[PDB]
Write a protein that binds this ligand. Structure first.
Ligand SMILES: [Ca+2]
Ligand SMILES: [Ca+2]
Ligand SMILES: [Ca+2]
Ligand SMILES: [Ca+2]
Ligand SMILES: [Zn+2]
Length: 316
C-alpha cells in the first residue's frame, strides 16, 4: 500500500518486545519499506486461502496474543534480509529485492511452516508439538532460504538433491540465528518446538542421530516417505556443515574447524555458482571443494577441512 513509513512496537511469540517497520495509511500495516521492495505480513485468519489480508492495526502497537506471530514473522524476515544483504551481498531472495511476503495464522493447529513458491506461510501449531512457528528465527530463515535455493541452484525437492535443499535451509537458518546472536545453537526449531519439553528440538545438526536422523551416508534412508527422506538424509549434510565449521572427530575421521563465516561463504558460493537442480551428495562435495578453492586456494586449510568433513560422513 501507499503510505508513510512508521515504526511500531509489540511482543513476539516468546514474549520479547521489539520494534517493527510499518506503513501508515488510515491503519498501520505490517509493511516494511526500509528493505528492498518491501516486507509484507498477512493474516490468514485460521484459513488456508493465501495470502490473506495485509496485516492492519489501528494504533501501531502489537501486544495482543493474536499479534505475536505476525510480529515475529515480520521482524525475522527483516533479520534474514539483512543477513543475506550484509553477509553475502544478496538483495532479497531473487537477488533483485523481490518483495518478501509472509502469512501467519495459517489453518488451525498447523504444526508447520513453509515456502510455497511465492511466499512464507506459518501455522500456529497445536500448542503441544509447536507454538507459532514464526517464533523461531532458524525456522523463518530456513524457509526464506528455500526461496533463495529455488532462485539459484533449484535443487529438486526429492531424494539427494532434496536432502541438500533441506540441509541448505538448516545451514543458513542456523547462520542467521547466529547472526542475530540470541541463544544461537546448531539445533533446529528449539524455540517453538514442544513447549512442555525443555532441551529438545526438531533436528540437530551437531548430532543428527539424537532424533534418529543419519549422520553417515551408510545410514541414508532409501525409501519413499518424506520425498525420499529429504528431512532425514539432510542430517548427513548438516553434520558435514557442522564439522566444517566447528571441527570434530566423527567415526574416527578428524576435521579441522574453520568457523561459521567461512562455512557460510563456502556454501553460499556452492549454492549460487555450482549446484544444479539434480545435484547429489557427491556433487555437493565437489561443489564445496571448488568453492573453498575459489575463495581460499587449492592448498588451503579450508579446502582440506571440506574434504575431511565429507570423508567423515561417508560422501566421496
Ligand atoms: Ca494494536
Ligand atoms: Ca537457539
Ligand atoms: Ca536453532
Ligand atoms: Ca521443546
Ligand atoms: Zn525446509
Amino acid at each position: 500500500i501507499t503510505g508513510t513509513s512508521t515504526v511500531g512496537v509489540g511482543r513476539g511469540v516468546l514474549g520479547d518486545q521489539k520494534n517493527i517497520n510499518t506503513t501508515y495509511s488510515t491503519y498501520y500495516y505490517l509493511q516494511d519499506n526500509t528493505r528492498g521492495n518491501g516486507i509484507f505480513t498477512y493474516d490468514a485468519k485460521y484459513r488456508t486461502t493465501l495470502p490473506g489480508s495485509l496485516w492492519a492495526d489501528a494504533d501501531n502497537q502489537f501486544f495482543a496474543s493474536y499479534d505475536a506471530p505476525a510480529v515475529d514473522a515480520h521482524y525475522y524476515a527483516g533479520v534474514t534480509y539483512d543477513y543475506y544483504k550484509n553477509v553475502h551481498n544478496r538483495l532479497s531472495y531473487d537477488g533483485n529485492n523481490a518483495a518478501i511476503r509472509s502469512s501467519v495464522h495459517y489453518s488451525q493447529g498447523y504444526n508447520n511452516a513453509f515456502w510455497n513458491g511465492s511466499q512464507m506461510v506459518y501455522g500456529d501449531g497445536d500448542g503441544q508439538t509447536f507454538i507459532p512457528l514464526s517464533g523461531g528465527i532458524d525456522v523463518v530463515a530456513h524457509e526464506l532460504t528455500h526461496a533463495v535455493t529455488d532462485y539459484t541452484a533449484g535443487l529438486i525437492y526429492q531424494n539427494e538433491s532434496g536432502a541438500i535443499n533441506e540441509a541448505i535451509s538448516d545451514i543458513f537458518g542456523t547462520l542467521v540465528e547466529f547472526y542475530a546472536n540470541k541463544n544461537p545453537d546448531w539445533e533446529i526449531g528449539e524455540d517453538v518446538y514442544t513447549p512442555g519439553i525443555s532441551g529438545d528440538s526438531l533436528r540437530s545438526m551437531s548430532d543428527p542421530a539424537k532424533y534418529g536422523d543419519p549422520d553417515h551416508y551408510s545410514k541414508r534412508y532409501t525409501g519413499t516417505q518424506d520425498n525420499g527422506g529429504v528431512h532425514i538424509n539432510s542430517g548427513i549434510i548438516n553434520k558435514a556443515a557442522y564439522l566444517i565449521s566447528q571441527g570434530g572427530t566423527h567415526y574416527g575421521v578428524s576435521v579441522v574447524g574453520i568457523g561459521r563465516d567461512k562455512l557460510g561463504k563456502i556454501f553460499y558460493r556452492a549454492l549460487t555458482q555450482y549446484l544444479t537442480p539434480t545435484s547429489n551428495f557427491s556433487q555437493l562435495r565437489a561443489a564445496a571443494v571448488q568453492s573453498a578453492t575459489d575463495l581460499y586456494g587449492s592448498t588451503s586449510q579450508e579446502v582440506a577441512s571440506v574434504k575431511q568433513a565429507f570423508d567423515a560422513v561417508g560422501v566421496k
